[PDB]
């Protein structure tokens, strides 16, 4: 009952935002082309060595730049590998940006190594320094919207358990999709980047 109330104002905030995204792909690729660089000077992506990092839909800023990055810099770079079943998701290891190219994709379009392939598992290696967090939505409080089915609030708390230090989730939003406040439960986020 009051758990409804909840996610009625997520469920709005959704469409909203969802509305105010589906911005021309031009300007989807400024505000992009401006985060990458933001993030590329950032100390926690500097420092940190492990990282995962998601495959942009595209109502979210384009990470692919920041791939590039990653790689240029001999760092261990990992992607989401979600099961629609469930609200479960591994983050797997990737070893080129090519290799992105290659990999099947889900009903979302969204691309990902398939079930016969056995994938090096982030938590199966030392964890993650420094996860990059996509959303709907965040406010300046810190707090995300996520797409609703639990994805990213349950593989944070395995963080939790796996690693002594958490890692430092660095969420990457438009202009757009930042909000005065957002409907909450779980879990914060360390930091959104915009503007
Ligand atoms: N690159 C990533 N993708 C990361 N990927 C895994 C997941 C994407 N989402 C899911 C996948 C299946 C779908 C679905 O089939 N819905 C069904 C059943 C869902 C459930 O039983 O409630 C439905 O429509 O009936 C909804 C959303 N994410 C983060 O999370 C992050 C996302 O924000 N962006
Ligand atoms: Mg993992
Ligand atoms: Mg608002
Ligand atoms: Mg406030
Ligand atoms: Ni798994």
Same mark, same amino acid.
Request: proline letters at 4%.
């Given at each position: 009952?009051?758990?409804?109330?909840?996610?009625?104002?997520?469920?709005?905030?959704?469409?909203?935002?969802?509305?105010?995204?589906?911005?021309?792909?031009?300007?989807?690729?400024?505000?992009?082309?401006?985060?990458?660089?933001?993030?590329?000077?950032?100390?926690?992506?500097?420092?940190?060595?492990?990282?995962?990092?998601?495959?942009?839909?595209?109502?979210?800023?384009?990470?692919?730049?920041?791939?590039?990055?990653?790689?240029?810099?001999?760092?261990?770079?990992?992607?989401?590998?979600?099961?629609?079943?469930?609200?479960?998701?591994?983050?797997?290891?990737?070893?080129?940006?090519? /290799?992105?190219? =290659?990999?099947?994709?889900?009903?979302?379009? +969204?691309?990902? #190594? $398939?079930? *016969?392939?056995?994938? /090096?598992?982030? =938590?199966?290696?030392?964890?993650?320094?420094? +996860?990059?967090? #996509? $959303?709907? *939505?965040?406010?300046?409080?810190?707090?995300?919207?996520?797409?609703?089915?639990?994805?990213?609030?349950?593989?944070?708390?395995?963080?939790?358990?796996?690693?002594?230090?958490?890692?430092?989730?660095?969420?990457?939003?438009?202009?757009?999709?930042?909000?005065?406040?957002?409907?909450?439960?779980?879990?914060?986020?360390?930091?959104?980047?915009?503007?």
């Amino acid at each position: 009952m009051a758990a409804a109330a909840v996610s009625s104002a997520k469920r709005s905030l959704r469409g909203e935002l969802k509305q105010r995204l589906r911005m021309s792909a031009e300007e989807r690729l400024r505000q992009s082309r401006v985060l990458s660089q933001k993030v590329i000077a950032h100390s926690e992506y500097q420092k940190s060595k492990r990282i995962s990092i998601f495959l942009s839909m595209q109502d979210e800023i384009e990470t692919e730049e920041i791939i590039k990055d990653i790689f240029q810099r001999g760092k261990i770079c990992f992607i989401p590998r979600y099961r629609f079943q469930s609200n479960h998701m591994d983050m797997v290891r990737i070893e080129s940006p090519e /290799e992105i190219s =290659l990999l099947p994709k889900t009903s979302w379009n +969204i691309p990902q #190594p $398939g079930e *016969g392939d056995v994938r /090096e598992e982030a =938590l199966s290696t030392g964890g993650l320094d420094l +996860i990059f967090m #996509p $959303g709907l *939505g965040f406010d300046k409080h810190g707090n995300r919207l996520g797409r609703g089915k639990g994805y990213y609030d349950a593989y944070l708390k395995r963080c939790l358990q796996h690693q002594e230090v958490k890692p430092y989730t660095l969420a990457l939003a438009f202009k757009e999709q930042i909000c005065l406040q957002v409907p909450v439960n779980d879990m914060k986020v360390d930091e959104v980047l915009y503007e």
